[PDB]
Each structure stands twice: as structure tokens, then as C-alpha cells.
Amino acid sequence: NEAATFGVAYLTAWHSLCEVGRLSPGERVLIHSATGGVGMAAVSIAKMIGARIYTTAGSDAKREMLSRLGVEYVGDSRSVDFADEILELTDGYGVDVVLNSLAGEAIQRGVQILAPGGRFIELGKKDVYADASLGLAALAKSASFSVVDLDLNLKLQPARYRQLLQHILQHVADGKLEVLPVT
Amino acid sequence: ATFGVAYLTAWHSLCEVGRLSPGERVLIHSATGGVGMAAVSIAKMIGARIYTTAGSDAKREMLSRLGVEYVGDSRSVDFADEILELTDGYGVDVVLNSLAGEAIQRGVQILAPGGRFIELGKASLGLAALAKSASFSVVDLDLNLKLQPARYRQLLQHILQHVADGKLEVLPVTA
Ligand SMILES: [Ca+2]
């Protein structure tokens, strides 16, 4: 129940960032809608890893609540302004991995700010990119586009996720992973 | 391709980016080439099921003696249906690709849920085809070496340790 929402949020953030994103220490990770379940899980895990965290949120209170967590950036999730704001903040480097859950122009804008070796991770529903396409030139600089549908993964590899969920809980249990709160 | 370029390309594409796992299915195009053969060696070590492709009879015959799951034609695109038919519609878990044009589109189409298509080679990509937790990754070794020489220098030592340990049997290029 509330036990499933937590598991689903942490399994998605962990699988996306650690296994598919290869997020390593000091890398820059852009997390959209960071205040959401999956979003705070991603921030939490990102802090465990030691990455540079760039976030995004829809209201002042939520954005203000993210800046209190001590992140290097907090943008507007309802806008595309984040792309230029981040390029300006990193002198053009951009980001190494993007945990995306936003629809529209944000997908194109997100890919565009990937630094060489960048990883874009799509968590959005199949309808956010259904009839859409990606120009392979955008990935030329050793970049990648990865869709992650946790609901599907669970069905196909139930056992592999039960152990990953114990693995994560063991981390929290022992204090190697701090579960960050909302407010 | 030299040993360094072959194994660095293959290991970074199959292990780091590709995440090849014991039992998974991997399609390796032009498998008799340098990168291709390093790719087969690493797959062997991992314990993956190997699906290959080669540009001539002599080369396909060479792949067959290695004992693999499939040996198709790289100057064709038939490999897509032949594999779906051979794997009962499952398709493949990861595709190491160096072929062009339709081979890519057809190669992305046969990824199994959770599939990883690594493009080594060289043109849009329909995102719907990546819906079942699939991905598309471009690997440019030269660019990578230039940007993270130290990380790659260290990966080469990691690979060479496996070779020295007898864990990674290096299959020679029968060319
Ligand atoms: Ca400027």
C-alpha cells in the first residue's frame, strides 16, 4: 500500500540512476519533478552516490523545498528555460544524465543538454513519445536514450527486483542511504 | 583494429553500456572483425547466447566453428526475421551494431523487452520502438579516449587482468 509506493519509487530511481544511468560520483544529474515520489528517491540516491544534483519543480513551495536540500540548481518543471539556465550554469557542459518525466519540448531540450557520454532516461508514459522520434545526430557524442517502464520490468523479472528491493532496504536500514523527506 | 581498440570498444559496449548478462542473447554484426571477435570472446566469458553476422561464406564458416547460436548474412537484412523465427519471437537482448541503413531500423525492431542497441558504427529513430524498457546508445571510442584517457587506461588494465587470469580467452582474428 504505502509500502508499494515507496518500493516502486525507490526501485525506479535506483534502476534508472545506478543500473541504466551508471551515475557515478561528481557527475551531473538533472532530476525533473524532484518533489514527486520517484523524484525525491532519485535525489536521495543521488546524494548517496555523490553526484551534482540539478532539479526542477512546478510551484514555489516545492522549488523552495528543494533548495533547502542543498542542490546546485532548481528550475521550473512547467518550462523549458532549464536547458539554457543549466548550460549557463555549467558554461556549456550541460548534464551527464537526465531523469525525465516531463512531456513535450522538454524531451528534445533535455537531450540537447547532454554532455558527451550523456544518458537520457525516459520515465514518461508511451504517449509522451509515441508518434515522436529522435534524430540520431543528437546522440553522436557517445550519448544514449533509455526508456524505463518499471511496471513492465517487475512482471518480466519479479525475482530480480525482489532482491534489488532487499538490497535497497538493507542500505536504508544500515544508514548508507538516507530517505529524504517532503514537507 | 588493434587489441586495445578491439577490446576497449567491445568491453565498454557489452559490459559497461550493454550490461550483457549470463544467458542473455547478443547479436554481434560482422563478428569476424577485430571488435567483432573481441565481442565474441567477452560474450563467451560472460556466458551469453551468441548471434552473429558475417560478409562472406568463408567468414560465416569461421564463425560456425566457434560454436554460436546463429550465423547470418551482414550484406542482408534477413537476419531480423531469421532471429525472431529462431528465438520464437523473443528477439535479442543486446545488439552490437556496425552495419548501416535498414540494419539499424530492423535491429532496433528485434530488441526484446529491456533490450539495449549499441550503435558502434558511423537518420532519425522512432521512440515507440524503445517503449518496452529499451535503449539506444552511440559509442564513439575515439571521443571517449580523448575525454577520459585515464578511465580508459584503467579499463584496459582491468581487461588485461582477466586475460592474464585465464578468465577472458582471447579468440584470434582468423582473417
Ligand atoms: Ca553565457
Swiss-Prot record, chain A:
Signal peptide stretch? none
Superkingdom is Bacteria
What more the UniProt record tells us is: Was identified as a high-confidence drug target.
Instruction: Describe its function.
Output: Part of the PpsABCDE complex involved in the biosynthesis of the lipid core common to phthiocerols and phenolphthiocerols by successive additions of malonyl-CoA or methylmalonyl-CoA extender units. PpsA can accept as substrate the activated forms of either icosanoyl (C20), docosanoyl (C22) or lignoceroyl (C24) groups from FadD26, or a (4-hydroxyphenyl)-C17 or (4-hydroxyphenyl)-C19 fatty acyl from FadD29. PpsA initiates the biosynthesis and extends its substrate using a malonyl-CoA extender unit. The PpsB and PpsC proteins add the second and third malonyl-CoA extender units.
The subunit field of the Swiss-Prot or TrEMBL record says: Homodimer.
- What protein does this entry describe? Phenolphthiocerol/phthiocerol polyketide synthase subunit C
Q: Which organism is it from?
A: Mycobacterium tuberculosis (strain ATCC 25618 / H37Rv)
The record's gene field reads: ppsC
The stretch of the full-length protein covered here is 1571 to 1753 of 2188
